[PDB]
C-alpha cells in the first residue's frame, strides 16, 4: 500500500548492481568454467551450478539479513527508513 | 464485538438531533455522551491544611482536565465534588419587601454582567492613507463577589439604587453541594480515574501517578496527593508471582531430572530449553 | 505594530519590485493579511516561485542564494517592514523550527508570564549552553489598544444596560450579522457596520450614542473613559495553559543534548511554578539520529546469525563483521573528502550524517559483507581439503578477484550518475551518491586486500 | 468573533472548547491561537498512529456539546472542525479584466465548493478573500 | 441593495418614513476586507487546495487542474486560470 | 419518598393569577437554583 517514495527508486538504482551481482557471479563462474572445464554450454553450466549455487545463496541471505532491520523504526524518519528497507528487501528477495 | 468508536458517535449523532427539544435549562447545561467502563481504577486523594475542600476542588479542575484526561488509557475522570461558582443566595422576604422577585435579580445579572466585544480603530475597509489599526477593549463582566453585590435590581427616581448587596448574600461557592468525600474521617477531595475500553491497569495507573508526581511541583504548597486505592499493585503482585513460581517450578524440574539422569551435563540442557520455548510463546502472545 | 493594509501593501509592493529584479524568479504571489507568525493588517507573506531548474544553472541561482539575495535587498531597501526570505524544508513540514512553550502553571498575570518569557530568552542568550543567535520570541506582536472604562455608577444614574453598550460598540466597530438574503440564487449574508469616517478615529469611539432606556441617545463621553494602553495581538494556550513560543538553537557545531538539558533547569530558576514544553518542526524529526546503536545492533546481529546459519560455524561470521568498518572509513572519508572539495572553490560544502548518508551506508555495509562472504566462503571450502590458512585464503582471493571487481565496479560506476546528479533533489541524490560511491570504492579496495587476511587471522585463532 | 480582541476571543470562545478537548482519544497535545482579527483557533495534534476518521468526529462530538455556551455571534457564525494538513499543494490564480476581485470571489465560490472539494485527495480548499455580502454602511451622525 | 435602502427605520405620524437610504450607504460588498492577494502585482484572487491525510500530490493536482479545465468552459468569459504554484511538477521530475 | 404536590387550578391563574411560566421561574429559581451567566474567575469562565 506504500506510494512510491524517492528513496525506493534510489534503492532499485543502487540495488540494480546487486541484482546483477548474482547473475554476474553465476555468468562469470560458468565463463570461467567454459574456459577452465571448457565443456559444451550444458555440461559447463552443470559444473558451474554444482560449485557456485551455495555460493550465490550466501550473497542473497546476507543482503537480506542486513537490510531488514532498517525497517523496524517508527516515525517520520521511521517511515522513510521502513520504505527504503522494504523495497530493497523485496527486490533482493526476487533477485534471489 | 467491540467498536466504541462507531457507536459513541452514532449516539452523539442522535443526541445532536435531540438537544433542541430538550428543556432550556438542560440544553444550557449540556448533555454528555461517554463510552464509560463504570469500574474505578484508582482514586487520588488530595489532602491539604491551608486549603479547604472547595478550594482544592478549584485547583483539582486545574490539574485534572489538562493532564489527567490526556493520559493514555483513561477515558474518564470523575471529580468528587464540583468546581466553584459565583453563588448568590437571595432572601425571598427582602424580595417581597422591595416588590422584587427572582426574575428581577436574574435579569439584573443577565444585563449587568455580559461579555462585550468592541472592535478596532482603522479596521477594513479603511480610509486612504490610514496609519494605525488598534483593537479597543471594554469589560462588562463582573469578577468579584463585591461587584456582583453592587448590581442594580431597581433604580429609584430620587437617585437611590436597590442592590444585590441588600437582597442577597453573594460570594464564591460551589456549583453543587451534594457529594462529600472523606479519607479516614478528615475532609479530603479525591479524583477517580476510570478506564476507557482500551484501558490498561499497570501502564495507565503508572502513568497517572508519575504524571501527578510532576504536577505536584506546581501545586500551591500544603497540597499532598495520596493513592490508597490502586489496582496496579495487584498486577505487580502477579508479575512477582510469575517470577517466583516459575523459579520454584524450574528449580524443581531440574532437581527431578538431575536425580534421574544423575549428571549435570545431562540435566543442564532441558532447563535451558524451557526459557527458550516459553520465550517463543511470549513472542506469539505479543503478535496476537 | 499599529500597521494597516495601506502600509502593508506598500511594503509588499516593494517586495514585488525586488523580486522582479531577480531573473531567477518567474512569478511572485504576495498575500496581505497572513504570515507564519499570525494574522492581521501587519502580517503579510509572499511566494516567489522560480523559473525552470534547467535555466537557473549558475553559482548564485540556487533557492538559498536568491533567498539570501532577496533578503539582503529587502533589509537594505524595504521601508516600514521587517522582510526575510526563507527556503522550504524538503519533507517533514509538508526554516529551522525550535518551539519552546513556556507556560505558567500558576495563575499569575500575563504581564508576569511574558516578563518571565523574556527572562528565559535573555538568560538563554547570555548562557552558552543555549548557543547564541536563533533567538526570537515566536507568536505575534504587542500593540497599543484602547481601553473603555465604564463605571456602573453612571449606568445606574442615567446610563443604559451593559447589553446595549455591547450592541453599540460591536455593531459600530466590527459589523453585525443580521439576516440572510437571496442573491442570484444563493442565500448570502447581510451585514451592518458603521461608516469608515466613524469607526476609525480613536476619539470617535465615545461619540457613538447608545440608546438610553427612555429612548435617549447618549454618547459614551458622559459615561466612559478611553485609556491608551498596551495588549497582546495573540494569546497562546498550549496544553490548557497560556504559553509563549521562544527560540534558541544548537546547530551544526553543538549537540542539542546539553541545551535541551539546561533549559529545564532554566525554567526552574524563575518562579519554580512555571513550566515549559516542546513543539517544533522538521528539526525535531532530525533528532531521530541517536537511535542508531539499535539499528546496527540489529544489523550485525542479523548478519552474524544468518552467517552462522548458512556457514554453520562462528568463525566465519566473525571474519565478515570484521569487514564492516572498512566501508565505514570509505563513506566517512568520502563525505569529509567532498566537504573538503566543495569548500575550496565557490560552494558551501553541505554534506553530513543525514538520512541519505545512513541509508546509503546501510547498502555499502551490505555489499561489503557480500564480498567478504564470497571469498571467505570459498576459503572455507579450501580449508576442508587440508589447504593451509594462507594457502586457502590466497587461492580463494585469486578465484574471486574478477567477479568481485566485476560486480562492485559495475555498481560503483552505476552510482556515478547519482554522484554527479544535479537539479531537483540533487542534494539528496548526491548525498547518497557520495557516501555510496567512495564508501564502496575504498570499501572494495580495503576489503579485497584485508579479507584474505581476515580468514588467516580468524582461522589460525579458531 | 468579529469584535473580540485577543483576550475576549481566547476566553469567551476558544477556552470553552479546549476544556472539553482532551477527552478525545489519542490526544497527544493541544494548542490555542487567539488573535485580534476576530478569528480563533485550537489545534489538537494526535499520536502518530493515523486515524483521522475517529478523531475528527470525537472533536465534533465535544464541540457539538459546546456550541450552546459559545457567544451568540459565534454560534450564529458557526465553529468549524477540520482534519487539516497546513501545507499548500497548489494555488489557482484567477485573473480577469471585465471582472473585479469582489466579483471573481463570488464565482470562485461557485466552482470551488461543488467541484474543487469533491475531488479526491483534497480535504480543504482555502479561498483568498470572501464571498460577497449585502454590506450596509450606516452613518452614526445621521443616526443621532 | 435598493430594496434594502427603502426599509423603514421609523414611521412618522404625518406619513413620512425614515429610510435606510437616508441613514446608510447600502450595496453589495464582501463579508470581510482583510486578505489581499496579488500575482506579480496585478490584483488576482487565487484558491489554495490542501491535502487531506490521505492526499496525493501528482494524482490530486492532476485532478484539480483538469477539472478546472472543464470548469472554465462555463465561466463568465474573460476569466482565466493560472497555476504557478504546483508541487506535481516536482514529482513529474522524479519519474523523469 | 414523601413528596410535596402543588395543585394549581387555572381558574386562579385566569382570575388574578399569573402565567404558568412565571410560576415555573419562581419555584425553580427558589428551590433548585438558576444558571444565569458566566463570569471570569482567576483566568477561567465559571458559573454564576
Residue numbers in the entry:
A (entry chain A): 385 to 480
B (entry chain A): 97 to 384
C (entry chain A): 577 to 670, 673 to 1040
D (entry chain A): 49 to 192
E (entry chain A): 241 to 336
F (entry chain A): 721 to 768
Cite, word for word, the article reporting this structure.
The membrane fusion protein MtrC, containing 412 amino acids, bridges MtrD and MtrE to form the tripartite efflux complex MtrCDE.
It appears that the opening and closing of the MtrE channel may be induced by the change in conformation of the MtrC membrane fusion protein, which propagates the progressive motion of the MtrD multidrug efflux pump within the transport cycle to the MtrE channel.
